[PDB]
């Protein structure tokens, strides 16, 4: 409750948005709800495949959903028809004609969500929490990142007291307005309660801002 949310301050410098179509004060509540529904359905449909980001667009009364994942095999399916099969249901949800795109990420351990994922899975399957934390740190460090701050709140390792713990390797700035700060948060459900996982990742210095 002290630090500012970094995405909301990095929106207008380097970090791209997740919804930037054109509405006029009438249908964006509806567009926002449709985006939320399609994202929450995509999460439940691809809870196994590691999925990090979902972006939306609305060119000329048509919805385009772009998914950035690391296991496109499950979503594509055999003979490349499951993607169209689920495009049918997302088009039914969105009403307007729909199309979907896949932006499979090579070496995606630098993605905030996919680096905060599978550690929730290890905690759920009762793997040691300290082992999971150190594995996540080493995996996020070995790919060339310059710093990952992940915050874990609530019953560390299925404990009985909601405590606060956080590791930090490298350097993770939060006040610099040029540093690419990929931020996300996830939750783990266990037999003893719920745990929160917040992740900041410092990609490095990026000058020139947008337009590559």
């Amino acid at each position: 409750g002290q630090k500012v949310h970094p995405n909301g301050i990095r929106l207008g410098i380097v970090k791209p948005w997740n919804s930037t179509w054109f509405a006029n004060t009438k249908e964006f509540a509806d567009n926002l709800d449709s985006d939320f529904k399609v994202r929450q359905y995509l999460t439940k449909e691809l809870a196994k495949a590691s999925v990090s980001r979902i972006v939306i667009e609305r060119p000329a009364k048509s919805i385009r959903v772009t998914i950035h994942t690391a296991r496109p095999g499950i979503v594509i399916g055999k003979k490349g028809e499951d993607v169209e099969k689920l495009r049918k249901v997302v088009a039914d949800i969105a009403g307007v004609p729909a199309q979907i795109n896949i932006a499979e990420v090579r070496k995606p351990e630098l993605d905030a969500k996919l680096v905060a994922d599978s550690i929730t899975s290890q905690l759920e399957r009762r793997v040691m929490f300290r082992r999971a934390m150190k594995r996540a740190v080493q995996n996020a460090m070995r790919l060339g990142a310059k710093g990952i701050k992940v915050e874990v709140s609530g019953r560390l390792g299925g404990a009985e007291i909601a405590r606060t713990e956080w590791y930090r390797e490298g350097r993770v700035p939060l006040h610099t307005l040029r540093a690419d700060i990929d931020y996300n948060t996830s939750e783990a459900h266990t037999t003893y309660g719920v745990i929160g996982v917040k992740v900041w990742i410092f990609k490095g210095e990026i000058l020139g801002g947008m337009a590559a």
Binding site: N7, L11, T25, A29
Partner: protein
Amino acid sequence: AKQSMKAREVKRVALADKYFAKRAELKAIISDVNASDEDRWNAVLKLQTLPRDSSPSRQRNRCRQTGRPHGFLRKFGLSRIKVREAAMRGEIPGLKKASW
């Protein structure tokens, strides 16, 4: 986000979008002085025994996602607490913190 209050609001739309023509013509007739007293009285008496909760200006504008009965904004159709988390995540095409 009470479920009991989340149905009355949608009823107040699903019933107010049906009596649009009759109410509009009645308002025009009773607003134009070029009418008859008996006809206007009969029209207002017929209008008043129409279901009360079907009036247009009898429903408070309710938030879309959470239904907070205060701070409803026309621009986003969402309350302040939800528009904060929406603009902070970045789903609003153009919402950046500002500085004049």
